[PDB]
Amino acid sequence: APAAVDWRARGAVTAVKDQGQCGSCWAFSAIGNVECQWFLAGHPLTNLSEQMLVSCDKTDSGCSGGLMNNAFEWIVQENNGAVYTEDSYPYASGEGISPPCTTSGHTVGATITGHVELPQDEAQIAAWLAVNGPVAVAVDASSWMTYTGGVMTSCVSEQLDHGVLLVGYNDSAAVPYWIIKNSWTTQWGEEGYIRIAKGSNQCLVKEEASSAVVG
Numbered sequence: 001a002p003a004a005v006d007w008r009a010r011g012a013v014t015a016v017k018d019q020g021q022c023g024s025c026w027a028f029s030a031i032g033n034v035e036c037q038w039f040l041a042g043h044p045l046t047n048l049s050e051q052m053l054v055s056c057d058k059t060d061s062g063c064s065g066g067l068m069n070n071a072f073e074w075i076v077q078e079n080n081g082a083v084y085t086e087d088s089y090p091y092a093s094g095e096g097i098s099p100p101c102t103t104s105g106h107t108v109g110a111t112i113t114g115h116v117e118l119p120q121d122e123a124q125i126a127a128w129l130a131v132n133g134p135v136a137v138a139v140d141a142s143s144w145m146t147y148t149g150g151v152m153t154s155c156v157s158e159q160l161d162h163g164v165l166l167v168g169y170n171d172s173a174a175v176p177y178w179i180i181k182n183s184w185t186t187q188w189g190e191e192g193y194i195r196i197a198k199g200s201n202q203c204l205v206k207e208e209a210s211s212a213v214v215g
């Protein structure tokens with residue numbers, strides 16, 4: 001695979017968002033992945049709705065948690081593969097309470113046909129990402145509250161509890177790393193991003209990787 005890949009360089013990644021006091025990380029991970037995949041399928045980069053999932057995805061638990069894989073399936077099986085634009089269904093769960101699901105007054109910004117679950121291997125995840133784009137991954141974010149910048153060479157890897165988005169990697173640097181987009185505003189980390197060492201399963205990054213497929 002390529003020595004280094006950064007999808008932000010190809011204009012495939014939207015701006016960093018804010019999940020607020022809502023434990024809706026899984027929704028930001030799933031939607032961030034869809035946004036990138038939609039763009040890569042030959043459509044203009046569009047901001048999609050995390051609120052749609054938090055409010056309408058009943059197979060998940062809104063601000064109490066959820067799984068990216070459940071979200072991908074809900075979109076396909078229950079919402080006719082549609083994903084609304086963020087402008088038509090704005091985020092309103094930052095206070096910690098998700099408003100009821102509304103089935104009208106929204107515009108479809110993208111559609112997906114399914115999803116694939118990637119192998120639990122960093123080299124294999126990197127290979128898929130280099131060709132197919134950003135991947136939704138679950139990580140242990142225990143040591144992330146104190147993160148201020150730089151490449152994290154040591155990360156607590158015990159329990160998956162957070163959903164984020166892998167946008168790239170750099171194998172040519174002193175210590176190879178992954179580039180990850182977080183949803184805790186641009187004030188956190190490196191303008192909303194975090195770099196963790198690659199190759200030693202830092203933060204359990206290879207455990208639950210997946211991506212939506214837009215036919």
Ligand SMILES: *[C@@H](CS(=O)(=O)Oc1ccc([N+](=O)[O-])cc1)[C@H](CCc1ccccc1)NC(=O)[C@H](Cc1ccccc1)NC(=O)OCc1ccccc1
Pocket residue numbers: 019022023024025026059060061063064065066067068138140141142143145160161162163208
């Ligand atoms: C994401 C949470 S976060 O709070 O933004 O992340 C963050 C990480 C770590 C810390 N920390 O160590 O201090 C602080 C902040 C989200 C939180 C959900 C939540 C809300 C309130 C209380 C506890 C938890 N985490 C999830 O939604 C996980 C993400 C995940 C984990 C493993 C594999 C894939 C995705 N999911 C989760 O808890 O799902 C439970 C569930 C399963 C099935 C159906 C419904 C819910």
